Protein: Serine/threonine-protein kinase PAK 1
Organism: Homo sapiens
Amino acid sequence: SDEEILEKLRSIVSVGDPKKKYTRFEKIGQGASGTVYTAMDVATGQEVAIRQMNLQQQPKKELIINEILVMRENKNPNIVNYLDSYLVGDELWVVMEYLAGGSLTDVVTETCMDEGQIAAVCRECLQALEFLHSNQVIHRDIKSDNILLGMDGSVKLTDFGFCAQITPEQSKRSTMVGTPYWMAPEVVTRKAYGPKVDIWSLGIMAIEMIEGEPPYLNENPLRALYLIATNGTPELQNPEKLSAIFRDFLNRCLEMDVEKRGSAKELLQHQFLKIAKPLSSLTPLIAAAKEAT
Ligand SMILES: CCn1c(=O)c(-c2ccc(-c3cncc(C)n3)cc2Cl)cc2cnc(NCCC3CCN(C)CC3)nc21
């Protein structure tokens, strides 16, 4: 219902008009998902990202409430911090911490990471995923675009628009929600999948970090999932360039058999993560990427 959704958003949000509370607006985005700005918390000096939406033209408002509630109750150092929300008339505002390091996409697209930098990023993501899965949250849309970076090398998952919450009674999902190139084969071949779809996705993201894109990126999306289903574990262009332990880490992420594929908990113990460089090692790639876009 339209009315009920508004009453429910009303209870969630803080009161009043937030344009007093934030000063230096610069639009950095737009679309059906509304408009995104960077701004400064006029009180505390903190730089924030704000999404403004008009509700009279948002299709699936249930997804919006769900996302906010999920951010609120699942805080974690490797998840982009949800700050506050506001509702002025039909205009909903969501305020998030701002991460100046850009997206991983910028990084993989403009720079070449070494194995130690990749291990560090992979470690940080698995920390997020272990926490989420242990709380029965499946992100379902893991990709470099949904990794945000701090200037200090900090690594945070974002965009929980497509996440699933599972339960012991309904602990498996079937909805095809993720971005095609990153989707596990079982999302298309079967109608039952679990949290390990995020691990497959992370594996594809690891491929991004090596080759600069996920496999089949040139192909039409429609055709990607067919290729994913039928090729199974994707091939690297120069596997021999990789360390044996990195290759083994990938094989565990990209295992066709869900049961053999590593869980996050399991993968956090993998020895590949132990060559991780300090997160600050990422700052030169971040700066360079920033300067290239
Ligand atoms: C990519 C823009 N962006 C966001 O959209 C959000 C964000 C996340 C979640 C919600 C949210 C949560 N719960 C519910 C709802 C309904 N929305 C809102 C928002 Cl504003 C946080 C965020 C933090 N830092 C950065 N800076 C790096 C951007 C990079 C720059 C340079 N490059 C080229 C392209 C990326 N961007 C952010």
